[PDB]
């Protein structure tokens, strides 16, 4: 039951190559299997290590002070998922404990082959409301805001709630830092 | 049965504000309802008008010659969807962009909702892309396409129509990359 995150980092700056390279390099990526291509990067591992890596990459990118966006898809349970392309402690948490970044976010939860999917989606919104990160609903997505630590905590709570109930789920996120 | 596309345009350039503004302004947006916020824009309308608009926006952005990416989600049929936020047949951009070209390497994922046969629809999607010559390979969590934008958007619309004819609520994510500096050009 391997978790994955396929994401892209978008630096709105002439210095984009360096910004991406630095954010990935600055992160402790030792607990996730990674593959980068010219469109995106995929991370695979436990839920814990995938979310820990994803937050750290965002915080390092945001702390470039450039306008950057992280847009990706979390997935777990996909039918036929390989047992390979993988290799506890949130290895980045201490290192980034003093970093902050605002993380306004649009996200969408996709519980697959699930008759009660709209209910799982409503529970996701309820979790965001309880945690203080929910802003509003929009067409095709919900909106979160707050600091990255809180927004990533909400996103993980939602994903965990859903993956406990339904075999295959995905969840898109679109998180914007230093927006003009 | 209104179709939608929530998308972001990411120009990897200091001039990003101007690039996004131009791409949206250059497009004939007369047949889609739009709403833009600081993260994304949503288009709503007919399948035809939404895809016509999406392709044009991509083509105009790419012809800025800057590295730009379009990332978004097409959606149709969500339970309880409003009958509002649309406008009440021709692909209005088709002719204006008929001479534009742009590489469209793409990762995409189809999500047929509340559908026991979804993995089968996804396989049908791969079959369409192969049939049209745009399929490259499967990757974790997505399929890859490549070709010119007119070809890639054609594959994407075909996949979308195939799925929406079979299941009530579908979504489909797309990530299209133009002018990547790592791409080898002849
Ligand atoms: Ca216009």
Swiss-Prot record, chain A:
Name of the protein: Putative HMP/thiamine-binding protein YkoF
Role: Part of the ABC transporter complex YkoCDEF that could transport hydroxymethylpyrimidine (HMP) and/or thiamine. Could also transport other HMP-containing products. Binds thiamine via its HMP moiety.
SUPFAM superfamilies registered for this protein in UniProt: MTH1187/YkoF-like
Residues that coordinate or bind thiamine: 9, 41
Record has Transport as a keyword: yes
Keywords: Transport
Single Gene Ontology MF annotation: thiamine binding
Subunit structure: Homodimer in vitro. In vivo, may be a part of an ABC transporter complex which is composed of two ATP-binding proteins (YkoD), two transmembrane proteins (YkoC and YkoE) and a solute-binding protein (YkoF).
Swiss-Prot record, chain B:
Gene3D superfamilies named among the record's database cross-references: 3.30.70.930
Descriptive protein name: Putative HMP/thiamine-binding protein YkoF
Residues annotated to bind thiamine: 9, 41
Species: Bacillus subtilis (strain 168)
Record Pfam families: Ykof (PF07615)
Function per UniProt: Part of the ABC transporter complex YkoCDEF that could transport hydroxymethylpyrimidine (HMP) and/or thiamine. Could also transport other HMP-containing products. Binds thiamine via its HMP moiety.
InterPro entries (alphabetical): HMP/thiamine-bd, MTH1187/YkoF-like, Thiamin/HMP-bd_put_YkoF
Lineage: Bacteria, Bacillati, Bacillota, Bacilli, Bacillales
Superkingdom, natural source: Bacteria
Subunit structure: Homodimer in vitro. In vivo, may be a part of an ABC transporter complex which is composed of two ATP-binding proteins (YkoD), two transmembrane proteins (YkoC and YkoE) and a solute-binding protein (YkoF).
Keyword Transport tagged: yes
Keyword list, A-Z: Transport
